[PDB]
Structures are given as C-alpha cells and as structure tokens.
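Hi R.,

Here are the chain sequences for the assembly we discussed:
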Amino acid sequence: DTICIGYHANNSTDTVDTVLEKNVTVTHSVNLLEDSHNGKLCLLKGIAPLQ
Amino acid sequence: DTICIGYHANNSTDTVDTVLEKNVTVTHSVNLLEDSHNGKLCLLKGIAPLQ
Amino acid sequence: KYVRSAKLRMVTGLRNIPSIAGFIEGGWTGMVDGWYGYHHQNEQGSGYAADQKSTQNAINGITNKVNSVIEKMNTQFTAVGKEFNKLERRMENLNKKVDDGFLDIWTYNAELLVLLENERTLDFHDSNVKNLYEKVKSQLKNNAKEIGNGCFEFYHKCNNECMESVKNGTYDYPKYSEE
Amino acid sequence: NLNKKVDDGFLDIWTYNAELLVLLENERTLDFHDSNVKNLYEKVKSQLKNN
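And here is the predicted structure of the full complex:
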C-alpha cells in the first residue's frame, strides 16, 4: 500500500565546486579540463614537423 | 496558543543594488570598495621610498 | 585590485522591513539576537528566539561568499602608465586602449559578480525561511487550525515538553487528536 | 612588457570567465534536476487530496 519517489543516488565519488558549498560529491561529471599530453612531438595532420 | 516564524529585521539602513529593484535597503553589508587613502606617501614594508 | 565604479554593495542581510503577527505584512523588529527564530505564547509563558542551525548554515554561506569573492580575484599586475615619445605614440594609443579596455572589463565583471552573488545569497536566506515554514507546516495537518495570515497557532494547550518537542521539529499530530 | 601584460590579462580573464560559467551552469542544471523531482512530487500529490 506504499508508493513514493526518489532520485537514484549511486556510489560515484567525484567532488564538484559550488559558490555555496565546499566541493560537494555528486554522481556524474563529464570533465572538461583535458590535461593528458603525450609528452612528445607529433605530426600535424600528417605533415612532418620541420625539426 | 500562538506560534510562528519571522526574520529579524533590524534598523540597519544601507542600500544595495539589484537588477530587479532600485537600491533596496538591507540590514548587513560588508562593503568591498575600500576608498580611504591616507593622502600621503608611506613606507613599503619598512624600506624607505627613493624620494 | 582597482575598479572604475562608485560602489559595490556586497550585502549580507535581508530587506529592511520594520513592520507576533506575521512577516508577510512586516518582518520582526524586536528580534536582535540573530536572524531567524520563533515567538510562541501559551499558558506556561512566552518568548522570542533565534534558531541556530539555519543561522549557522546561513553564516557559513556568508563567510563562503565573502571569502570566495576576495579569493576569486587572480594576480595583480603593475599597471603603471608608461611613457612614449611624441613620435611613437601609436605605442601610447594602443597601450591606452589596452588599459582602458582592461579596467572597463573588470568593472563590468566585478559589478556583475556582486549582483549575482548578492541576489543569490539573499534568496538563499528567503528560501531558508520558507523551508522552516514548510517544515513546521508539515506535521500540523489536522491538529492546529492554522489561522492563515502568515502566522500559525495551536488548536490546544501544551506545556514545556510540547514546546521543546516542537522546537526539535517532531510535533505530535495524532497524540493530541481528541477533537 | 606590454605584450606580456596583454597575454596575462587575457589568460586571467578567460580563467575567470570559464570558472564563472562552470559554476553558473552546474548549479542551474542540478537545481533543474531537483525541481524536476519536486514537480513529479507535487504532480502525484495533486489527485490524492482525501483518498
């Protein structure tokens, strides 16, 4: 005889910043700051670099 | 037999700007625009100015 | 940092509404201790009050907002107006353009941030008042004939244990339902 | 000196703008999600006045 509502709260554990709270943990966050450089020079659409 | 809620409204009388109203009066406002210069030259962490 | 405006009213409190009977027509005036609390009267006595947890979360919000606005400005540069000859001032013209653009842009940004955060925090305060309103509303479905007009009542009498228990927020709805 | 000033100003300004936009939109969408939960709450509430 029960029925009620809720929001799926999985275990995802990454923290996001708010102007009203310190780094709240929230489930999904597609990051935007790409910070993985290979560390070495690479082609430019196939044209070799003038080394 | 009465009970009810309210927000403390003291007499503080400084006016703050909103995009939806003209300079509403609101109680507390820690100002941010420091505009009190002494009007004269002063030391720089103790090192005298090359006058 | 420097800005080219006249005043930026970083604001903490609530609207000056000086008006016991309800805040819709006018906010409480006698209250001095804090921001939000209670005033109830019964057979056993009466009294003002200021709540703690709501005010504590709110002042935490205030400190976060002030320390944010002060620590969210980045480095400062020595923007000294340099000198150029009477023949090279294309340099001077461009430099004046750059500096005026920068002071202008920062004026705009600081004003906009002030507006944004001050509205957001004051409506935060409003929403906190409202949530406490609805919280006390919750358990009182049928055992305190709510008089409306913004301020509540009790259908019946109750002693110190009653006021402390509802002070916590666990008002006994079915327990005192003998009419 | 002028060029370094310009470039530092630009990277600074874009840091500020990107951070502010992130804050704005992330708060707005998460409270959008909250408000959606609430509207479904009130919707199911509606017809259940007395039964």
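Chain D is about 90% helix and 0% strand. The two ends of chain D are 76 Å apart (CA to CA).

Let me know if anything looks off.

Best,
T.
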